[PDB]
Symmetry: D2
Subunit: 254 residues, 4 copies
């Protein structure tokens, strides 16, 4: 285990499924105190009961990270309960139907940007003051290879993930000298419940995604991403700041 | 001049000053039909007058590119007036006071993202169908080196510019086989009226920017950026699609 | 044509075929003085005849760019003949059989590196002092998308093209404030005489390459690459320095 | 510690000092079997005796990694002695006096490329067949931020490191589906014995480096780099392949 993570207070969003669930369990396995933030009631109760079963300290919070009020509330609640916030994992996200620009409705554009990008801006803005007062904090953002390439998702998701990497670089640049580290992890194809965000994704968007899927038959498990996120949050990575770490098995290096 | 630009219809946003003004004049000198879009009336009239004084065809449109209705209206007006839209230069943009995440108000965040990013999504969504009909079209987005690095502006601007490069890659990927090219130009430091976006820029943000200017040398003239934009819009650049072309004199290569 | 290129002295290596031939012709059409550097006698005489048939000024020099003495020779003869060297296009290059690391012989490794990378180091080292004295000069290196990705060629070519971009960045960073610009152009797939570099290309290497080639079907013509190289050599690109401009129709943006 | 590294055979080049010594010790503490490769005998003896003292299994090999015969020999010796090679850390390297292109002598260019790049080619070529037979292997290359930017070192070093990243991507692309992972770690400024490669570095080269070194005062310790290298060599990083991980405290994100 990473000794530096023992008793550190870690907020994990989207904790009820896939990568988020794996992140929560991995941090718990390292004796961190986990604040599991999840939109869905039953999923939240399930991950909370699992961590309790592991004999770890866990606080469950039902919230919609696209809502500023919900975010500010769980940040306040975490601080009031534990008196510190050491790690923030902005992980919750949704897909966009692989919808290309001309096919994007105002509703889709706004919702994907809100859940995948605004959420991280709200949380980072709220937690940074607390981390600065501590003189130390780490923010890990779950981006995607869609944050560096153009055909792995629709326009809303691609734009939001590029923007999320931008937010990561911004935080690292401005606050790195004050004890804050911000890093982004870019998964490729992972077996989770996110899907494509639609039972009928754009035919045009799929024409591109399907071709890219011909490049590899490898599918990562949530744990493979969580392993990297937890490492980056530990003092073992004290000098990794601002990087966009790709965890795609080599897919984008071809 | 570029023969392939003669009589082509080009929309240029932020045409009343700096890079936009230079883009409009350059296309006009290449005998393109220019639709000059600008928020400020006096600036709009000035650029319109400059092009007409050269005997060139120009249509002035006073609009706020952060408003979807204004964008959809100038696209419809351009098509109704000239029956085609060959090039779209999403150039208008504003700075963000070099404001770091913790100091960003909801207002600033929304305003910078709307002007610097949403504007481009609105215009691209509206013009793409017309370009697909034509079987040809070029979208050139004026990004910034803040779209690939984290200390050249505040968080809102950095996030918006990263998102704009993402929008560019998305369009290039999905519509490249249908005759559309989308490219981004990333200027470094250019002599214009954009400034820092505030008379009282963030102290923390400025500390960061100042460190970066220690790497700077020459200041580009707006024409130096416009020259690249116009070239990319011509058939000479038929195989440049999706790239984020850096025009910073070498600042980011250090 | 670009007025700033009229009567400028331009050295073009690998001028006897494909992209190099197209580069020589394009500069000639812009009334530049072209020094055609080529390894093969017949090809050299062919491009020289073509330029003379166009009524343009050309100097032919047979040389093997992998030999430092030969490089010093064409640089010196150019200077003796025209008293200046304004543009150096390091374009000559060969493929590597798409040979993966484990299958690379010492001879193949050295040959590919010498022809595709060392050649550009030798020529740049020789022309820089001349250009600094002039107060102005431009070096354009023809790289490849294999210089930013790993499956587009064998190991020798990929390493050499990555090194070439590094050489480009180095020159741009160190001499940019003294009037020198160094840029790289990265083509994707172009129909020329380069082939695969072997009659029996690596089975393993080909499996990877073939999958990537399946992603898109738009193939650039040599003229499409020459068009960007000539523009970058002109004063229109005075603020483009150190960038690796991708000209692949969008292949690497997917 | 990482369970997956217990009893794994790890080759560490440049093990007698700085980052390499930290790498050797870190793997030893994970109970890996360490093959310490170092040029200088006294340094080699010091690290070998240090690990032996810790009660760990270590094999010292005095070798010059720029010599193919030396590399092929320590690879054969490792396999003959331990019957397997699980991890290869190509870490040895030297600086280049921050020498810019025009000032580079053939001796400097040749030596730096040989030690910083050819060495990794020789070792990778020799160990890949062994790893392929095992169905698993990891190669970690210690590059540098000079592998992605142009002003952090002289031309030889910058070109060599860019090429090393290319070698990394090539191996990852071609062998990633066969059980091999190849990754690069890019340190910024670390307090070791490498220095600037000269007590009288190039004046011109230094003009640029000095500006970059003015961006941050935070310097990583060798252990901070070793921590990331060891993590990437473990099964925890099973889905990290072909990436160039930056460990510079945020220097290049500005
Ligand atoms: N699975 C992949 O292939 C993949 C690849 C690259 C990046 N990612 C990124 O990984 C992150 C999570 O991915 P996942 O695959 O585990 O998905 P998932 O759907 O399995 O899990 C996401 C969890 O987030 C929760 N969630 C969604 N919207 C929320 C909101 N507004 N507020 C609070 N919780 C919300 C869900 O209810 C769900 O439990 C996202 O940022 C996603 O974009 C996934
Ligand atoms: N100048 C630089 O240093 C620099 C560096 C990198 C990128 N850029 C980018 O260049 C573009 C224009 O830059 P500039 O420096 O010429 O600025 P500028 O202020 O000189 O010109 C921008 C013009 O856009 C107009 N504008 C602003 N908001 C608008 C809105 N909502 N609707 C319509 N018009 C609007 C302004 O009124 C102005 O005339 C921006 O996207 C900017 O981010 C500039
Ligand atoms: N054609 C493509 O698909 C492609 C894609 C990306 C990059 N490139 C790059 O474009 C450049 C030239 O490519 P091309 O496709 O026109 O190839 P080509 O083979 O058609 O032309 C190259 C010319 O270089 C000459 N040449 C080869 N070795 C030489 C040496 N040692 N000294 C002097 N001249 C030499 C040849 O004789 C030939 O006339 C190379 O750097 C290549 O790597 C090509
Ligand atoms: N220290 C830094 O600031 C820094 C920053 C970025 C990258 N790096 C990279 O880290 C690696 C090692 O760096 P370091 O700072 O620990 O240097 P160091 O000088 O402290 O240690 C390097 C060790 O390599 C050995 N060595 C040199 N040439 C050799 C050869 N031909 N064969 C075998 N051994 C040889 C030396 O004798 C020395 O013990 C290099 O690849 C270097 O480029 C260092």
């Amino acid at each position: 285990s990473y000794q530096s993570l023992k008793n550190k207070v870690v907020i994990v969003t989207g904790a009820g499924s896939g990568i988020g669930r794996a992140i929560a369990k991995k941090f718990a396995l390292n004796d961190s105190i986990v604040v599991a933030v999840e939109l869905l009631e039953d999923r939240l109760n399930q991950i909370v009961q699992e961590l309790r079963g592991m004999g770890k300290e866990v606080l469950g919070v039902k919230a919609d990270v696209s809502k500023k009020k919900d975010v500010e509330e769980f940040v306040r609640r975490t601080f009031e309960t534990y008196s510190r916030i050491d790690v923030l994992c902005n992980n919750a996200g949704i897909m966009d139907g692989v919808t290309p620009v001309a096919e994007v409705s105002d509703e889709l554009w706004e919702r994907v940007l809100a859940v995948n990008l605004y959420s991280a801006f709200y949380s980072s803005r709220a937690v940074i003051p607390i981390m600065l007062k501590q003189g130390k904090g780490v923010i890990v953002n779950t981006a995607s290879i869609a944050g560096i390439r153009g055909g792995f998702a629709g326009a809303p998701y691609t734009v939001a993930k590029h923007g999320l990497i931008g937010l990561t670089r911004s935080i690292a640049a401005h606050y790195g000298d004050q004890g804050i580290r911000a890093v982004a992890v870019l998964p490729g194809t992972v077996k989770t419940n996110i899907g494509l965000g639609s039972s009928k994704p754009s035919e045009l968007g799929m024409r591109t995604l399907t071709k890219l899927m011909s490049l590899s038959s490898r599918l990562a498990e949530p744990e493979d991403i969580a392993n990297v996120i937890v490492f980056l949050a530990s003092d073992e990575a004290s000098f990794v700041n601002g990087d966009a770490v790709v965890v795609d098995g080599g897919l984008t290096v071809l």
